[PDB]
Scaffold this active site. Structure first.
Site, PDB file in Angstrom:
ATOM      1  N   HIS A 108       5.966  18.499  10.553  1.00 54.43           N
ATOM      2  CA  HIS A 108       6.323  17.303   9.818  1.00 54.43           C
ATOM      3  C   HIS A 108       7.487  17.506   8.860  1.00 54.43           C
ATOM      4  O   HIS A 108       7.803  18.631   8.491  1.00 54.43           O
ATOM      5  CB  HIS A 108       5.101  16.783   9.049  1.00 54.43           C
ATOM      6  CG  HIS A 108       4.194  15.907   9.864  1.00 54.43           C
ATOM      7  ND1 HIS A 108       3.102  16.396  10.547  1.00 54.43           N
ATOM      8  CD2 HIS A 108       4.214  14.572  10.097  1.00 54.43           C
ATOM      9  CE1 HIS A 108       2.491  15.403  11.171  1.00 54.43           C
ATOM     10  NE2 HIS A 108       3.142  14.283  10.910  1.00 54.43           N
ATOM     11  N   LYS A 154       6.027  15.359   3.322  1.00 55.63           N
ATOM     12  CA  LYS A 154       4.646  14.947   3.556  1.00 55.63           C
ATOM     13  C   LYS A 154       3.735  15.653   2.558  1.00 55.63           C
ATOM     14  O   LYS A 154       3.926  16.837   2.258  1.00 55.63           O
ATOM     15  CB  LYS A 154       4.236  15.160   5.018  1.00 55.63           C
ATOM     16  CG  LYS A 154       2.731  15.248   5.263  1.00 55.63           C
ATOM     17  CD  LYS A 154       2.237  14.489   6.510  1.00 55.63           C
ATOM     18  CE  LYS A 154       1.841  13.050   6.163  1.00 55.63           C
ATOM     19  NZ  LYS A 154       0.703  12.547   7.000  1.00 55.63           N
ATOM     20  N   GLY A 204      -1.270  -9.235   5.080  1.00 59.51           N
ATOM     21  CA  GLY A 204      -0.559  -8.212   4.355  1.00 59.51           C
ATOM     22  C   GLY A 204       0.868  -8.233   4.804  1.00 59.51           C
ATOM     23  O   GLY A 204       1.469  -7.169   4.999  1.00 59.51           O
ATOM     24  N   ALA A 205       1.399  -9.451   4.963  1.00 65.98           N
ATOM     25  CA  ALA A 205       2.730  -9.685   5.549  1.00 65.98           C
ATOM     26  C   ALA A 205       3.913  -9.210   4.722  1.00 65.98           C
ATOM     27  O   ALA A 205       5.011  -9.102   5.248  1.00 65.98           O
ATOM     28  CB  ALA A 205       2.909 -11.140   5.918  1.00 65.98           C
ATOM     29  N   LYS A 206       3.705  -8.921   3.444  1.00 66.19           N
ATOM     30  CA  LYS A 206       4.780  -8.311   2.671  1.00 66.19           C
ATOM     31  C   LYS A 206       4.719  -6.777   2.522  1.00 66.19           C
ATOM     32  O   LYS A 206       5.685  -6.166   2.102  1.00 66.19           O
ATOM     33  CB  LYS A 206       5.010  -9.055   1.351  1.00 66.19           C
ATOM     34  CG  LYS A 206       6.144 -10.074   1.470  1.00 66.19           C
ATOM     35  CD  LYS A 206       5.770 -11.468   0.954  1.00 66.19           C
ATOM     36  CE  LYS A 206       6.879 -12.456   1.314  1.00 66.19           C
ATOM     37  NZ  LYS A 206       6.581 -13.802   0.756  1.00 66.19           N
ATOM     38  N   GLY A 251      -3.444  13.823   8.678  1.00 66.37           N
ATOM     39  CA  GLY A 251      -4.661  13.125   9.041  1.00 66.37           C
ATOM     40  C   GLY A 251      -4.898  13.365  10.516  1.00 66.37           C
ATOM     41  O   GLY A 251      -5.979  13.826  10.898  1.00 66.37           O
TER      42      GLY A 251
END
Ligand SMILES: [Mg+2]
Ligand SMILES: [Mg+2]
Ligand SMILES: [Mg+2]
Ligand SMILES: [Mg+2]
Lengths: 245, 245, 245, 245
Positions: free
Chosen positions: C132, C136, C7-9, C142
């Site tokens: 946050h 969000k 998932g390098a991109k 989570g």
């Protein structure tokens, strides 16, 4: 200064009696608790009175003190627009009588509130966290609510807090006092604590007031008793006497 | 408002240039860097100038601007009593020109500083903690020291912080800026942060200011530019413009 | 260690690629994105793989890697008991392959979570505050929920948080994740922050984790990659690799 | 469990007597303060003893308790390597006797310390802040020092805290306990408080322990008294009994 204390067996008065007794510059001129006639105040040349008796009786007391040119530091709550109107009225006849009515005598608390007021218009976001012992009956505190209202009022005409929340759990975002989130933490070990948070992209400002004693109102009541003289007629809230306006 | 910017190739200048552009109610009328002749300011009917150029050349600029009736928001430091005095002088000839010089434009920072000043005299104890990235050269920060000064001064005539320490380690109690402990934390991950604490038996108040961006001064500069007209002659420090009633 | 990245991109992938490069003790041996055939991993004698590809294709990857004796640090979520069970299965055939799946790679986050778990049963009161940025989507985060779960579970068999609240405003007391109040603050300027508080009469303990970067997971992924070999078969969550004696 | 308390007119013992009396599951078998013979313990079938008498007498007590197979929760300090050696010795002859010696019985404190220990190796920077009432004799606290040593020890072999400070004011960077800054805040209103801060680029972790009562050690001593049985021979520090190792 010749100080008289009312409802002086009631927890506050009793404390105030001690404070005034211990205090260098002030002499305790009268200690009346329930069942004592109000003529005793003038009988001892009382200049100022501390009053924290029940709301039902305050009105009856204030009238007497005002009648007699007796300055009044009042801590009793249950005051309404219409009751201020009333006091404001009695004072018309006695221009040299000072009366101070304040919901809150803890200098830290009052400062903390006044700072929030002054800050609130310079930030995109503002929330209130309040934390108390788990024996407290109501959520949020009186103090947190009043705080939030002030902020809301000071921000009358800015956009509301930005907030992209779209799924949540009931209560995850706290209460909604006049558009501004109040969260209430109840936790063993705690006494009374409040944290006002503001933020804007790039910077945050946080004001925290912690109160560790029932007795932290004393320094304030004393302050008011030593200064009430400077401001004729009705003053509401301690903040003007903190020489901040 | 038609705004000119000096020192436009330095870090602060280049920023305000973007800033003035992005801002809808304001247009940028000249952007010079060291050595572009000042005349260009009038050539473009610049009403206000932001100045952050080096100390050496600031006095040279201020003269021109005041000469020409051009209001100046100045962020350069290295200002001295006798330099203020000088400015003060040039302004006497032009009573319609406003000049603002401030050590600090982060609204949060200025507020936190002000609150400290206002709070300082109602508590027995006051300390300052400042926390910064581990690449900062100097401890305590400029801002921490200025702050301690203010508190010290506002406490002119109270007892010093109570402190029964009799055995310690060098530095355990931090620095001593005018009788007030200043502690410097240097910590990876941090940017610029400051926490003022005051305490009295029974209650504590804490004010914290966190700055997460290089660019948190921008809102303040902008504010100043938008408001500078309201106050003729020299103003020092942003807090008067934060309109505090 | 010879490391491959899927998932390098995507955002996480592209990061670890920089990360593996910068790192001296490790070299990058393959970088694929969705659809580059897996074979390339063995073609380059990849020992460990970092995987953060979408949930749909993760099971497909895991199979290949385990088939080929390739250790896997996996950050994709959407993992279920029955998915763990599945993984658990593939691993039985290759006892020399280690796989790590974790909901969270920020070392700070994992530690703060662990400490909460360890602390949970020694205090009467426990709440979670999470703070946050105002962009969000979901409240509580989570991470806040997972955390509350853990505390709840570690408190399996103590009384519930003491709480005398009898009048309130909806949400004043926050959410209720398994008997534990979770409050969500949404505030401009903030990134990701979490504060766990526990209290008991006489003492309070608080653990706060602040994350200021998108990229704070990197040290953890790297750590995992460096250590994954030490533990054969499936490990869930980074905390076992934080080697806690 | 049949609990005996020593130095039972001394502030701790007295408290412990009350705790044990009030406590459901334990019966108080002997209350000896100075001037009372130690035979009374066995005369009442004491299984465990709480001991916090002065250091001069502890050694003499421990010997007796060990001799007689009497478990000992000891809170007295002044223990040395050589004194542990000694106790360790007496216990050789009685393998069924448990003895626990601990510098600190506040569970919050012990947890807070143990967490710092576990965290310290995962961050570039670590500092300790400790804050106490202004009546405290020494700076930093016993507890802050011991904490710092642990951190230093846990970081034996990482680079020292990064720190680019090059001009400062004496003390601005706090104390230097084994390479790690301890700052001491002394402030009216405070009791006992400690904040351990760690940071690394991108994230920070903060552990805070506040203690609001003299009496917060009680729950711990009780814990130890209820569990001492599980671990034969000498245990040092409460942390093993918190089932964390
Ligand atoms: Mg007196
Ligand atoms: Mg524009
Ligand atoms: Mg490399
Ligand atoms: Mg009992």
């Amino acid at each position: 200064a010749r100080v008289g204390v009312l409802g002086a067996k009631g927890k506050v008065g009793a404390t105030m009696v001690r404070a005034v007794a211990a205090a260098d510059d002030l002499t305790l001129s009268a200690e009346l608790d329930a069942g004592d006639p109000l003529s005793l105040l003038t009988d001892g040349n009382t200049e100022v009175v501390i009053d924290f008796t029940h709301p039902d009786v305050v009105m009856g007391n204030l009238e007497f003190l005002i009648d007699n040119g007796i300055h009044a530091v009042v801590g009793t709550t249950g005051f309404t627009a219409e009751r201020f109107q009333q006091v404001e009225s009695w004072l018309v006849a006695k221009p040299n009588t000072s009366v101070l009515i304040a919901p809150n005598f803890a200098i830290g608390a009052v400062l903390s509130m006044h700072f929030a007021k002054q800050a609130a218009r310079f930030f995109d976001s503002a929330e209130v966290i309040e934390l108390h012992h788990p024996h407290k009956a109501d959520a949020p505190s009186g103090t947190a609510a009043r705080t939030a209202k002030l902020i809301a009022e000071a921000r009358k005409g800015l956009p509301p807090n930005p907030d992209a929340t779209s799924t949540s759990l009931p209560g995850a975002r706290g209460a909604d006092v006049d558009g501004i989130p109040v969260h209430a933490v109840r936790l063993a070990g705690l006494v009374a604590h409040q944290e006002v948070l503001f933020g804007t992209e790039g910077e945050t400002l946080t004001i925290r007031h912690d109160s560790l004693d029932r007795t932290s109102f004393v320094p304030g009541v004393l302050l008011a008793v030593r200064r009430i003289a400077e401001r004729p007629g009705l003053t509401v809230g301690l903040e003007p006497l903190l020489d901040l306006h």
